[PDB]
Structure formats: structure tokens, C-alpha cells
Design an enzyme around this catalytic site. Structure first.
Site, PDB file in Angstrom:
ATOM      1  N   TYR A   1       0.797  -1.220   0.000  1.00  0.00           N
ATOM      2  CA  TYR A   1       0.000   0.000   0.000  1.00  0.00           C
ATOM      3  C   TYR A   1       0.829   1.269   0.000  1.00  0.00           C
ATOM      4  CZ  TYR A   1      -3.718   3.132   0.741  1.00  0.00           C
ATOM      5  OH  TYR A   1      -4.628   4.141   0.570  1.00  0.00           O
TER       6      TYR A   1
ATOM      7  N   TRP B   1       1.163   5.717  -1.626  1.00  0.00           N
ATOM      8  CA  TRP B   1       0.875   6.837  -2.503  1.00  0.00           C
ATOM      9  C   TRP B   1       1.859   6.979  -3.632  1.00  0.00           C
ATOM     10  CZ3 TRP B   1      -1.783  11.637  -3.407  1.00  0.00           C
ATOM     11  CH2 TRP B   1      -3.113  11.594  -2.991  1.00  0.00           C
TER      12      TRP B   1
HETATM   13  N1  LIG Z   1      -2.773   8.041  12.587  1.00  0.00           N
HETATM   14  C1  LIG Z   1      -3.164   8.111  11.226  1.00  0.00           C
HETATM   15  N2  LIG Z   1      -3.909   9.185  10.827  1.00  0.00           N
HETATM   16  C2  LIG Z   1      -4.173   9.417   9.515  1.00  0.00           C
HETATM   17  O1  LIG Z   1      -4.926  10.327   9.221  1.00  0.00           O
HETATM   18  C3  LIG Z   1      -3.498   8.688   8.529  1.00  0.00           C
HETATM   19  N3  LIG Z   1      -3.800   8.801   7.127  1.00  0.00           N
HETATM   20  C4  LIG Z   1      -3.760   7.591   6.316  1.00  0.00           C
HETATM   21  C5  LIG Z   1      -3.976   7.829   4.854  1.00  0.00           C
HETATM   22  S1  LIG Z   1      -5.678   8.180   4.297  1.00  0.00           S
HETATM   23  C6  LIG Z   1      -3.025   7.421   3.957  1.00  0.00           C
HETATM   24  S2  LIG Z   1      -3.459   7.123   2.221  1.00  0.00           S
HETATM   25  C7  LIG Z   1      -1.714   6.852   4.449  1.00  0.00           C
HETATM   26  C8  LIG Z   1      -0.541   7.161   3.554  1.00  0.00           C
HETATM   27  O2  LIG Z   1       0.554   6.402   3.946  1.00  0.00           O
HETATM   28  P1  LIG Z   1       1.566   6.155   2.550  1.00  0.00           P
HETATM   29  O3  LIG Z   1       2.434   4.672   2.603  1.00  0.00           O
HETATM   30  O4  LIG Z   1       0.709   6.361   1.068  1.00  0.00           O
HETATM   31  O5  LIG Z   1       2.680   7.305   2.620  1.00  0.00           O
HETATM   32  P2  LIG Z   1       3.846   8.064   1.858  1.00  0.00           P
HETATM   33  O6  LIG Z   1       4.552   9.202   2.942  1.00  0.00           O
HETATM   34  O7  LIG Z   1       3.081   8.940   0.587  1.00  0.00           O
HETATM   35  O8  LIG Z   1       5.055   6.923   1.431  1.00  0.00           O
HETATM   36  C9  LIG Z   1       5.064   6.649   0.069  1.00  0.00           C
HETATM   37  C10 LIG Z   1       6.508   6.274  -0.233  1.00  0.00           C
HETATM   38  O9  LIG Z   1       6.620   6.010  -1.595  1.00  0.00           O
HETATM   39  C11 LIG Z   1       7.888   6.497  -1.992  1.00  0.00           C
HETATM   40  N4  LIG Z   1       7.957   6.651  -3.435  1.00  0.00           N
HETATM   41  C12 LIG Z   1       7.343   7.592  -4.198  1.00  0.00           C
HETATM   42  N5  LIG Z   1       7.510   7.372  -5.522  1.00  0.00           N
HETATM   43  C13 LIG Z   1       8.191   6.220  -5.591  1.00  0.00           C
HETATM   44  C14 LIG Z   1       8.595   5.494  -6.705  1.00  0.00           C
HETATM   45  O10 LIG Z   1       8.163   5.618  -7.838  1.00  0.00           O
HETATM   46  N6  LIG Z   1       9.307   4.356  -6.431  1.00  0.00           N
HETATM   47  C15 LIG Z   1       9.240   3.781  -5.174  1.00  0.00           C
HETATM   48  N7  LIG Z   1       9.915   2.546  -4.989  1.00  0.00           N
HETATM   49  N8  LIG Z   1       8.837   4.512  -4.089  1.00  0.00           N
HETATM   50  C16 LIG Z   1       8.493   5.807  -4.337  1.00  0.00           C
HETATM   51  C17 LIG Z   1       8.055   7.763  -1.189  1.00  0.00           C
HETATM   52  O11 LIG Z   1       9.367   8.172  -1.149  1.00  0.00           O
HETATM   53  C18 LIG Z   1       7.488   7.361   0.148  1.00  0.00           C
HETATM   54  O12 LIG Z   1       8.448   6.960   1.101  1.00  0.00           O
HETATM   55  O13 LIG Z   1      -1.428   7.130   5.787  1.00  0.00           O
HETATM   56  C19 LIG Z   1      -2.515   6.737   6.588  1.00  0.00           C
HETATM   57  N9  LIG Z   1      -2.129   6.739   7.992  1.00  0.00           N
HETATM   58  C20 LIG Z   1      -2.707   7.615   8.962  1.00  0.00           C
HETATM   59  N10 LIG Z   1      -2.449   7.439  10.288  1.00  0.00           N
HETATM   60  N1  LIG Z   2      -1.549  18.936   2.529  1.00  0.00           N
HETATM   61  C1  LIG Z   2      -1.841  17.590   2.210  1.00  0.00           C
HETATM   62  N2  LIG Z   2      -1.179  16.622   2.884  1.00  0.00           N
HETATM   63  C2  LIG Z   2      -1.690  15.358   2.935  1.00  0.00           C
HETATM   64  O1  LIG Z   2      -0.975  14.554   3.520  1.00  0.00           O
HETATM   65  C3  LIG Z   2      -2.842  15.020   2.224  1.00  0.00           C
HETATM   66  N3  LIG Z   2      -3.468  13.740   2.239  1.00  0.00           N
HETATM   67  C4  LIG Z   2      -4.439  13.387   1.203  1.00  0.00           C
HETATM   68  C5  LIG Z   2      -5.160  12.133   1.496  1.00  0.00           C
HETATM   69  S1  LIG Z   2      -4.675  10.443   1.071  1.00  0.00           S
HETATM   70  C6  LIG Z   2      -6.464  12.146   1.913  1.00  0.00           C
HETATM   71  S2  LIG Z   2      -7.065  10.451   2.164  1.00  0.00           S
HETATM   72  C7  LIG Z   2      -7.199  13.416   2.184  1.00  0.00           C
HETATM   73  C8  LIG Z   2      -7.854  13.325   3.551  1.00  0.00           C
HETATM   74  O2  LIG Z   2      -8.621  14.450   3.833  1.00  0.00           O
HETATM   75  P1  LIG Z   2      -9.240  14.198   5.428  1.00  0.00           P
HETATM   76  O3  LIG Z   2     -10.890  14.685   5.587  1.00  0.00           O
HETATM   77  O4  LIG Z   2      -9.092  12.565   5.945  1.00  0.00           O
HETATM   78  O5  LIG Z   2      -8.374  15.096   6.432  1.00  0.00           O
HETATM   79  P2  LIG Z   2      -7.852  15.263   7.921  1.00  0.00           P
HETATM   80  O6  LIG Z   2      -6.528  16.356   7.944  1.00  0.00           O
HETATM   81  O7  LIG Z   2      -7.362  13.705   8.488  1.00  0.00           O
HETATM   82  O8  LIG Z   2      -9.127  15.875   8.894  1.00  0.00           O
HETATM   83  C9  LIG Z   2      -9.681  16.995   8.282  1.00  0.00           C
HETATM   84  C10 LIG Z   2     -10.198  17.823   9.464  1.00  0.00           C
HETATM   85  O9  LIG Z   2     -10.950  16.968  10.286  1.00  0.00           O
HETATM   86  C11 LIG Z   2     -10.710  17.440  11.595  1.00  0.00           C
HETATM   87  N4  LIG Z   2     -11.193  16.521  12.600  1.00  0.00           N
HETATM   88  C12 LIG Z   2     -10.458  15.614  13.303  1.00  0.00           C
HETATM   89  N5  LIG Z   2     -11.206  14.908  14.181  1.00  0.00           N
HETATM   90  C13 LIG Z   2     -12.432  15.463  14.085  1.00  0.00           C
HETATM   91  C14 LIG Z   2     -13.666  14.954  14.482  1.00  0.00           C
HETATM   92  O10 LIG Z   2     -13.794  13.997  15.214  1.00  0.00           O
HETATM   93  N6  LIG Z   2     -14.781  15.729  14.275  1.00  0.00           N
HETATM   94  C15 LIG Z   2     -14.679  16.882  13.532  1.00  0.00           C
HETATM   95  N7  LIG Z   2     -15.884  17.590  13.277  1.00  0.00           N
HETATM   96  N8  LIG Z   2     -13.527  17.144  12.840  1.00  0.00           N
HETATM   97  C16 LIG Z   2     -12.406  16.451  13.151  1.00  0.00           C
HETATM   98  C17 LIG Z   2      -9.219  17.727  11.640  1.00  0.00           C
HETATM   99  O11 LIG Z   2      -8.863  18.563  12.692  1.00  0.00           O
HETATM  100  C18 LIG Z   2      -8.998  18.290  10.266  1.00  0.00           C
HETATM  101  O12 LIG Z   2      -8.951  19.681  10.206  1.00  0.00           O
HETATM  102  O13 LIG Z   2      -6.406  14.567   2.087  1.00  0.00           O
HETATM  103  C19 LIG Z   2      -5.476  14.530   1.059  1.00  0.00           C
HETATM  104  N9  LIG Z   2      -4.765  15.787   0.895  1.00  0.00           N
HETATM  105  C20 LIG Z   2      -3.502  16.028   1.517  1.00  0.00           C
HETATM  106  N10 LIG Z   2      -2.987  17.288   1.552  1.00  0.00           N
HETATM  107 MO   LIG Z   3      -5.497   8.172   1.819  1.00  0.00          MO
HETATM  108  O   LIG Z   4      -5.416   6.210   1.681  1.00  0.00           O
END
Ligand SMILES: NC1=NC(=O)C2=N[C@H]3C(S)=C(S)[C@@H](COP(=O)(O)OP(=O)(O)OC[C@H]4O[C@@H](n5cnc6c(=O)[nH]c(N)nc65)[C@H](O)[C@@H]4O)O[C@H]3NC2=N1
Ligand SMILES: NC1=NC(=O)C2=N[C@H]3C(S)=C(S)[C@@H](COP(=O)(O)OP(=O)(O)OC[C@H]4O[C@@H](n5cnc6c(=O)[nH]c(N)nc65)[C@H](O)[C@@H]4O)O[C@H]3NC2=N1
Ligand SMILES: [Mo+4]
Ligand SMILES: [O]
Length: 771
Positions: free
Chosen positions: A112, A114
């Protein structure tokens, strides 16, 4: 050496590079980009930063003892440099060994992550392509962003809904009277895209403010979204939004304001939900007064929000953070239910939207063709083979056990090897300390990255991949809008001994006696030209003209036109004629009560939206810890990406990941702004650096996800993380038995001023042997 300028793109935008003597010196945003991201500079820096991986490395421990190695020292940095030829021989031998001994069930290839945009250089798809040739693999299902919501939506509205086009921004500007951002920070989260982003939300958001529309933000943090609008800010105790939605539904029934005609002709099962809401089944009328007791939000505010929403054209745009919690399925389930009661679904400017904060949802789609790229083979080839993504640690620990998912029961496979490319499971997965011991179950762990992440440090075998800027590729601009197709042109030469994932997988397919099947007789440009040509034949049939490949490459971009895409209103045909255009549910209507879900019999996922106690919430009955950690998405990172670059200097506090704390909460613990703090619970302990602000509501603290885990000692159970990985504190449990999503924001902890020994951060420098 080269000197010139080259256009390309990434997850942060389209840009122009400046090369001086073969080195990229600057990345300037595209001129048509309406809102460039400040993170571009970090993207350039990641090519050359000190945590860039140079050579193929093999864990010392694994080289000498193989499957008999001590698996507890993984992550300690004791690596041996090897030639590429040796490493490739090793990876293929090991892949084939696990396939002959354990079968396809022994290889976990969900990988998994990005990764990076690009239809050719799609690492994760490329790995499955090779694994398909090797005999098979165990795959992952769903994702960490909408884990709960994507499974429950189809039972309620008929489709996924979260990854579908929204009612256009322009339509909102002329029609919406009230805009509600519920648990969403569109200013922050709209910087990036899954494919090259167009940054379409920014103009949309400015049109709203210029228009004078009233904007209400419901979130615990005082975000930039709140500041841009100077909005009305509701601050609920994290995890109590469902109670609030119930309270608002109660008022609406109590004062008889809800839309009875809407309920009657467009929904189903409402009369089975009424009793619940009124308190007839449990003796607890779900009033505003009751919701206040749980949320902390004043009862009268709740009653006033409900009235204001019923008498104005309202749009409820909800984020996804509130479903990345225990019982996540009820959040959006109750919001559709509440949206249904107001009766605006399918009206221009009204209803609800689940993607206005993500990847440009709401930006008018063009009529251009669709672009496709390399596939993993499967549609022309021949325990469980798929597990819900967040149950990976459970799998490892319970080989053979049963698990529930969406109404079925399956068994976990017995995995012996994990192959990970383009992801960071040692930063993204919950309960780090649980996972660290669970990984000992795996014989072999292979990782590809260009940055020495915590995941790469923990691998048995690490291979240096190149960035997107050291190769050629083609990709789409706009996840929803389909603005154009971009040529992602090579900028510089592959650094040190880095190689594309494609080249590494070709080489390993070759040793399995299957190279021509992997490559298909084509080289880099061969593959790119065939993707473009396919789309061009598609466009042609639909009356969209597109240049010839070389013409297109010379220009670097093709933009498509917008015909009727700015007039699109989600759910309008459904509302217009429900018999002719029904929803994809059993009943064909909005299902407030689910007979299907009731048949499943799941305790933690009833047949209608319901309020339940989470594993742990702030101020909950018997809660052990006092502060709620809002472990949300980072402003200056894309998850963990860009942590090891110059950007870290502007947010780190004493070299650590920042922790936003309320002045009252800091006073109580005698904490001063700038201090190094220890954040801990029964699950784990981390160090962060405090920033004091009243942006965060009292009782809640903000520590973003994405911090690069930096253990003091990998052999010591519960070792203190020196940097600030919030997932050292989260718990690893499914949301419910229906979706098994992750509960990454269901965290409670205590904070104290760190008074221990001085600590040396070591995650932002490469391993001694990797220099
Ligand atoms: N506590 C908690 N709160 C959260 O809100 C939270 N959000 C979740 C969400 S929705 C997401 S999707 C995940 C994301 O977690 P995710 O594993 O998608 O995170 P990335 O920091 O984007 O790591 C991607 C890696 O791919 C590498 N990379 C990029 N391009 C390439 C390439 O082409 N070749 C290869 N071999 N690698 C490359 C980058 O260098 C990087 O180290 O975290 C989740 N985890 C979360 N934890
Ligand atoms: N800048 C940037 N960095 C990223 O890493 C990034 N990640 C991308 C990815 S994979 C995804 S999946 C999307 C996710 O977009 P997503 O909706 O999962 O975003 P979050 O920052 O986890 O939370 C958004 C807001 O929800 C609030 N929140 C937290 N807990 C509560 C709750 O219980 N109730 C209420 N009412 N609000 C709460 C947080 O404080 C925050 O401001 O964003 C995407 N866009 C991204 N942009
Ligand atoms: Mo995501
Ligand atoms: O994700």
C-alpha cells in the site's frame, strides 16, 4: 553537462525545472496553476537530500543467516552494500523460494502506498505484474482514507460516493446559501492530487467568499479554512459528531420541520429509525440537551444549526477524518440521513458532498478521453487472497483465523514474505509497537524507495529506486476534471546507483525465466507512446482532436475542453424522476434502515445510524487519558513524504515533529512553548516539540501523521521514538465488522514535559554503511 528548462509534474502540481550543469536548481510552478503549493521546493530537495538511497543494501543479519537470522534487530542500520547483480539474484531466489514452499498465499504484495503519478512507472502495479509471473500473491483491499465510508456508502446510496464527481463549484456559487465544512480542511488538503492536481478547489472557494455565502466550519482545530472565510466555528469533542447529527435530527422532528415529502418518496426505513431517535427503544431521547452532554457543544447552538440548515439552500461537505475512527461507518451514514431529512438532495447547491476537500472534486470535468497505463497482467492470465488493508498485522499474528468483512467470513493466509514498493507502512500503520513485534513473523522483507524511510531501515533487502524526475512518463491532470494529459519529462540522470522500479522488476522477471512476458518487447518510450495513442484514438471517436505523439511530446501538454461539465448537479436525475432513475440499492432509494445490514447480525454495525461508545474518547466514561490527539494530515508534507528535506526546518520544534497545545493544557503541566515533550499512553511513547496556541480546542492536541519513526533502540520493546511518529500511540483495531477500516484517529494520550537525557535524532541521516 545539461543547461535548459524542463516541464513535468507531481502530486503537488505541474512545474518547470531549471537545470544547471546537469543539476536541477529550481522548480517553478506552472503559469496556469491557480494555487501552487509551497511544498514544491521540498520535492526538488528530495532528489538530493542526505536520506537519498544510493546503493543496493542487504541487512547484515540476513546475508549471513537467512531465514535463521535474528529478526529483532531489523531497523538498527547494520547494512551491507552489495552489487546490483547480487541483490537481484537474491530477490528472485527468495521470491521463488517462498512461492515453491509456501505458495501464492505466502507472499504479501498489497504494497500500500501513494507512490508517484505516472501510467508507466506505477510501482505498485508493476510489483503485482512481476508477482503474477512468480506464481501469485496476497493482495489488499480498500484503503486507509475512506476505509469505513467506501463499504457503507454502497449499502445506503448505491455506490461508493467518496471517489465520485461533485456538484460543480460554479453551481454552488450561484445557488448555495449556507456552506458547511464538516470535519474538512479544504485549504490544506487540496494542495495535492492522486494524479497531477489542477488545484480546482481554490477558485471555487474564492467564488464563495466573494459571493458572501455563509460558511460554517465544524472542526476541533482553528484551520486555514476557518480563517479564509472568518467562518462560524463549531468545535465538537473529537469523535462526537454522530451525537450532534442525532441531536439536530431530534430538533427537526421535535419542531416538525423536516421534509416529510422527501423522506416519503426518496428514502426507505425512516419509520424504523424514528423510535430510536425519540428514545422509544432505549429510554434515551436523542435531544440537543443529550448531545450537548456528549459533544460539549451548547444545546441551543445545535438547535439553531438545524433550523438554519432547513430554511436555507445548504451544502454539507464532510471530510473523512471522522470515519477514520472506531465505528467510522456511522459518521457519513448519519450525515446522509440528516441530509435526507433536510430535503435538498439533488437540488442545485444543496445535498451533501464527500469529496470537496480531495483532489479537486467539484472542478468541472472536461470531455477528453481517458488515459490508461501498464496493468499487472491478471485479466489475461489464469486462505483468503485479499484482506482488508488495515488488517495486515492481524493477518501476520493470526494465520488461519477467521475474519468478518461486509457480510462474509474468510480466513487469513499464512504470509512469510512482504514486498513493499511506493509506501511507508512503518509510518502509516497504527500501533507501531504491535507491528514491530509482528514483523518478526516474516522471513523476508524487501523494500524499494529513494528515501531512507523507517520502512526502508527495517527491510532485509533495500534497493535504490529513482524519482519520477529521473525518467519519462505520461499522466493525467485532474482526478475529477480531466483537464489534460501531461508529458512527465526526464529532468536529470538517475542518481548514484538508483534504478527505476520497472527496470528492477524486469530484471527479476528475467531470473524467473519470464522477462519477455513482463516487458512485452517494449522500452520506456514504447510504452508511453502506446498509452497516448490509445487515448488519442478514444478522443478521436468522441470528437476531441489530439496531436500526434511527437507533436504532443514537443508541446508537453494537451488540454481538453469543457462542454456541459460546469452544470452538473449530483443526484439531480434521481430527484427529478426516482422511478426512471433509481439508486443502486435493493429498494432503489436512500436506505436509512438496512435489511441487508440487519441480516449480517454485526454487533458493532447495526441496521441504522446509531451512537455507540468508541474504544476511547475524550471525557468518556472511564477514559484513562486526558487529551485527544488529532492525528490529521500534514500541511507541509504529503503523509510522510518530504520529511527528510529542507521543509522540516520551518515546522520542527527542537528538531522534533510539532505538537499544537492549548495554553490552558500547557499551563496545567507546566509546559512552555518550545519545550520538548513526552507524549504517551499504554500503547507507546514519543517526543515532540510544543507550539502553544488556542487554535486547538482545550482537551485536544494536534500531532500530524507522517512523522518518520526514530526508535532509540530497536531491541527494546516500547522504545521511545525520538522524532514524533503519531502511530506509536494509535491502536490497531477494525472500525467495525462491516468494513474493517483503520481507526487511526481514535487516540487518547497524556503529555508531559520531557526531562530525560538528551537525545540524538538519527532518522534524517542515512545509515553509516549507506554513505
Ligand atoms: N494516525 C493516522 N492518521 C491518519 O490520518 C493517517 N492517514 C492515512 C492515509 S488516508 C493514507 S493514504 C496513508 C498514507 O501512507 P503512505 O504509505 O501512502 O505514505 P507516503 O509518505 O506517501 O510513502 C510513500 C513512499 O513512496 C515512496 N515513493 C514515491 N515514488 C516512488 C517510486 O516511484 N518508487 C518507489 N519505490 N517509491 C516511491 C516515497 O518516497 C514514500 O516513502 O497514511 C494513513 N495513515 C494515517 N495514520
Ligand atoms: N496537505 C496535504 N497533505 C496530505 O498529507 C494530504 N493527504 C491526502 C489524502 S490520502 C487524503 S485520504 C485526504 C484526507 O482528507 P481528510 O478529511 O481525511 O483530512 P484530515 O486532515 O485527516 O481531517 C480533516 C479535518 O478533520 C478534523 N477533525 C479531526 N477529528 C475530528 C472529528 O472527530 N470531528 C470533527 N468535526 N472534525 C475532526 C481535523 O482537525 C482536520 O482539520 O487529504 C489529502 N490531501 C492532503 N494534503
Ligand atoms: Mo489516503
Ligand atoms: O489512503
Amino acid at each position: 553537462l545539461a543547461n535548459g528548462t524542463v516541464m513535468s509534474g507531481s502530486h503537488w502540481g505541474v512545474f518547470t525545472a531549471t537545470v544547471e550543469n546537469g543539476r536541477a536548481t529550481a522548480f517553478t510552478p506552472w503559469e496556469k496553476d491557480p494555487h501552487p503549493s509551497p511544498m514544491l521546493a521540498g520535492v526538488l530537495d528530495s532528489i538530493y537530500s542526505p536520506t537519498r538511497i544510493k546503493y543496493p543494501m542487504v541487512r547484515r543479519e540476513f546475508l549471513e543467516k537467512g531465514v535463521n537470522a535474528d529478526r529483532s534487530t531489523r531497523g538498527n542500520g547494520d547494512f551491507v552494500r552489495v552489487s546490483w547483480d547480487q541483490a537481484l539474484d537474491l530477490v528472485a531466489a527468495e521470491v521463488k523460494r517462498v512461492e515453491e514452499t509456501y505458495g501464492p498465499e505466502g507472499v504479501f504484495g498489497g504494497s500500500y502506498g501513494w507512490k508517484s503519478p505516472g501510467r508507466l512507472h506505477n510501482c505498485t502495479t508493476l510489483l503485482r505484474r512481476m508477482l503474477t509471473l512468480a506464481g501469485g500473491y496476497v493482495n489488499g483491499a480498500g484503503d486507509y482514507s475512506t476505509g469505513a465510508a467506501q463499504v457503507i456508502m454502497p449499502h445506503v446510496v448505491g455506490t461508493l460516493e467518496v471517489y465520485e464527481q461533485q456538484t460543480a463549484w460554479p453551481v454552488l456559487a450561484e445557488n448555495t446559501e449556507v456552506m458547511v465544512f464538516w470535519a474538512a480542511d479544504p485549504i490544506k488538503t487540496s494542495q495535492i492530487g492522486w494524479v497531477i492536481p489542477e488545484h480546482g478547489a481554490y477558485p471555487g472557494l474564492e467564488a464563495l467568499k466573494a459571493k458572501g455565502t455563509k460558511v460554517i466550519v465544524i472542526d476541533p482545530v482553528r484551520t486555514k479554512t476557518v480563517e479564509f472565510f472568518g467562518a462560524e466555528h463549531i468545535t465538537p469533542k473529537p469523535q462526537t459528531d454522530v451525537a450532534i447529527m442525532l441531536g439536530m435530527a431530534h430538533t427537526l422532528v421535535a419542531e416538525d420541520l423536516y421534509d416529510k415529502d422527501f423522506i416519503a418518496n426518496y428514502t426507505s426505513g425512516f419509520d424504523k429509525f424514528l423510535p430510536y431517535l425519540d428514545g422509544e427503544t432505549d429510554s434515551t431521547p436523542k435531544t440537543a440537551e443529550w448531545a450537548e452532554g456528549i459533544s460539549g457543544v451548547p444545546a441551543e447552538t445545535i438547535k439553531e444549526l438545524a433550523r438554519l440548515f432547513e430554511s436555507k439552500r445548504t451544502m454539507l461537505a464532510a471530510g473523512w477524518s471522522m470515519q477514520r475512527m472506531h465505528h467510522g461507518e456511522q459518521a457519513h451514514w448519519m450525515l446522509v440521513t440528516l441530509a435526507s431529512m433536510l430535503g435538498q438532495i439533488g437540488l442545485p447547491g444543496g445535498g451533501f458532498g464527500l469529496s470537496y476537500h480531495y483532489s479537486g472534486g467539484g472542478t468541472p470535468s472536461t470531455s477528453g478521453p481517458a488515459l490508461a497505463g501498464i496493468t499487472d497482467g491478471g485479466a489475461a492470465t489464469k486462505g483468503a487472497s485479499v484482506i482488508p488493508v488495515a488488517r495486515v498485522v492481524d493477518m501476520l499474528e493470526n494465520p488461519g483465523a477467521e475474519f468478518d468483512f461486509n457480510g462474509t467470513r474468510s480466513k487469513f493466509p499464512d504470509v512469510k514474505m512482504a514486498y513493499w514498493v511506493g509506501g511507508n507502512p512503518f509510518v502509516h500503520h497504527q500501533d507501531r509497537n504491535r507491528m514491530v513485534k509482528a514483523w518478526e513473523k516474516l522471513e523476508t522483507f524487501v523494500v524499494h524507495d529513494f528515501q531512507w524511510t523507517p520502512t526502508a531501515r527495517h527491510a532485509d533487502i533495500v534497493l535504490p529506486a529513482t524519482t519520477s524526475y529521473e525518467r519519462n512518463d505520461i499522466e493525467t491532470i485532474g482526478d475529477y476534471s480531466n483537464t489534460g494529459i501531461l508529458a512527465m519529462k526526464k529532468i536529470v540522470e538517475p542518481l548514484y546507483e538508483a534504478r527505476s522500479d520497472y527496470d528492477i522488476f524486469a530484471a527479476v522477471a528475467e531470473r524467473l525465466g519470464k522477462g519477455a512476458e513482463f516487458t512485452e518487447g517494449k522500452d520506456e518510450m514504447g510504452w508511453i507512446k502506446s498509452f497516448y495513442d490509445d487515448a488519442a484514438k478514444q478522443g478521436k471517436a468522441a470528437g476531441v482532436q489530439m496531436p500526434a505523439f511527437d507533436a504532443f511530446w514537443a508541446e508537453g501538454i494537451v488540454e481538453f475542453p469543457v462542454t456541459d461539465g460546469a452544470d452538473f448537479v449530483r443526484y439531480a436525475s434521481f430527484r427529478e424522476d426516482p422511478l426512471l432513475n433509481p439508486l443502486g440499492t435493493p429498494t432503489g432509494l436512500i436506505e436509512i434502515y438496512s435489511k441487508n445490514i440487519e441480516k449480517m447480525g454485526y454487533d458493532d454495525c447495526p441496521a441504522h445510524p446509531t451512537w455507540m461508545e468508541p474504544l476511547e474518547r475524550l471525557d468518556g466514561p472511564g477514559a484513562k487519558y486526558p487529551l485527544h490527539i488529532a492525528a490529521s494530515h500534514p500541511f507541509n508534507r504529503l503523509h510522510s513524504q518530504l520529511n527528510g528535506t529542507v521543509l522540516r526546518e520551518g515546522y520542527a520544534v527542537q528538531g522534533h515533529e510539532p505538537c499544537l497545545m492549548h495554553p490552558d493544557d500547557a499551563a496545567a503541566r507546566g509546559i512552555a512553548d518550545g519545550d520538548v515533550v513526552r507524549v504517551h499512553n499504554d500503547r507507546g511513547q514519543i517526543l515532540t516539540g510544543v507550539k502553544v496556541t488556542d487554535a486547538v480546542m482545550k482537551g485536544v492536541i494536534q500531532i500530524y501523521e507522517g512523522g518518520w519513526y526514530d526508535p532509540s533502540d530497536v531491541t527494546e520493546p516500547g522504545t521511545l521514538d525520538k522524532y514524533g511518529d503519531v502511530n506509536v500511540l494509535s491502536a490497531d483495531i477494525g472500525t467495525s465488522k462491516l468494513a474493517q477500516g483503520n481507526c487511526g484517529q481514535t487516540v487518547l494520550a497524556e503529555v508531559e514535559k520531557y526531562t530525560g537525557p538528551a537525545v540524538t535524532l538519527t532518522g534524517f541521516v542515512a545509515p553509516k554503511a549507506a554513505e
